[PDB]
Symmetry: D2
Subunit: 115 residues, 4 copies
């Protein structure tokens, strides 16, 4: 499992459960082509997205699409979408973990690359 995604909720202090996550890979014409996707588990994780053979070097984008996730106050609803764009590089560690922390008007993301 070369690519793992973990989503957390900064308002509730818990994993972000059952949230849709999409991964795209950039094509020669600069178009974003679907690569893998799924919904986070009860631990806020998404495993089995891809395989070592399929996850080659290139530019990828991880989009997190929350829907009716906050269900709370919010004058001027932001409808925020985390959009994490990175380059997969073979010259570094092989395992990638993309973590995202969500709030109504903010988000933070970190990459943990290991072997």
């Amino acid at each position: 499992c070369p690519l793992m995604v973990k989503v957390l909720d900064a308002v509730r202090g818990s994993p972000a459960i059952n949230v849709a996550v999409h991964v795209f890979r950039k094509a020669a014409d600069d178009t974003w082509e679907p690569f893998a996707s799924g919904k986070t588990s009860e631990s806020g994780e998404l495993h089995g997205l891809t395989t070592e053979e399929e996850f080659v070097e290139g530019i990828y984008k991880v989009e997190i699409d929350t829907k009716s996730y906050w269900k709370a106050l919010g004058s001027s609803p932001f409808h925020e979408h985390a959009e994490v764009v990175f380059t997969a590089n073979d010259s570094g560690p092989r395992r990638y973990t993309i973590a995202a922390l969500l709030s109504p008007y903010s988000y933070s993301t970190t990459a943990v690359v290991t072997n």
Copy 2:
């Protein structure tokens, strides 16, 4: 000024200077149309991107080109850029400030929305 961007560098503890910023607006056909762009000043701020008349209701994408910034400082960053998608002026005209905090393998973006 209805749309401003401020960027900070967490490694050097300073404003992020001369960072390129691109703003897009989603079109009817679902494609991203260029809206405005510029570069941060010595204070890490970018003003004058648009006007009240031009900044209509819609879905916007703010892309901060962090890879170029880190590389210009001799670092090898993980992300291509720091990006956030949101809906603006859906409850009437508002002033938006997108504040970003950058590190080589992590970043955060927050929106300050006022009347």
Copy 3:
């Protein structure tokens, strides 16, 4: 103004107003001595905490009372406060801005240091 504090609210997308802030300086006997305190303005900023003469070299602790802030808004936060310890003016006098971003179960603090 050599020491300023700015606080933002990630749930409401606005400055954090009327937040109490306490600053301490470590004494010779290893205890924390009160240094300065105040509350953020309508812009979420706190100026005039100290002067160049009073802000000597040392180890400082900035405590932002986030529990009181969240509770005053009807929320039940996780942390007692947002705190950070650092060494100031160890390379000569500098201007410091401590910027904090708050959510009920998470927070971040960053320092902008200029000449």
Copy 4:
């Protein structure tokens, strides 16, 4: 294992290995008494800090003390110390995970409370 701590490095994109972490519990006289401590593992985690019987309600502080951790540039070295103060509450989930993301002039922390 009611209390777990995970530390990440935002500059290197990896777990923060072999870093000293201290946990204190506030006493009646408002003094901070040592409670548990250790050094992070190769996964940046610290398990076995305490037991369900020992981890009672109260105010706790998690201090992260990095030493010669950055070993890089840094005019006006911040010598930052993450200080996470929270109240353990029995009316909520039983398992606590305190996560911290470190940078030279900034840090972020989040609490994930589950059952």
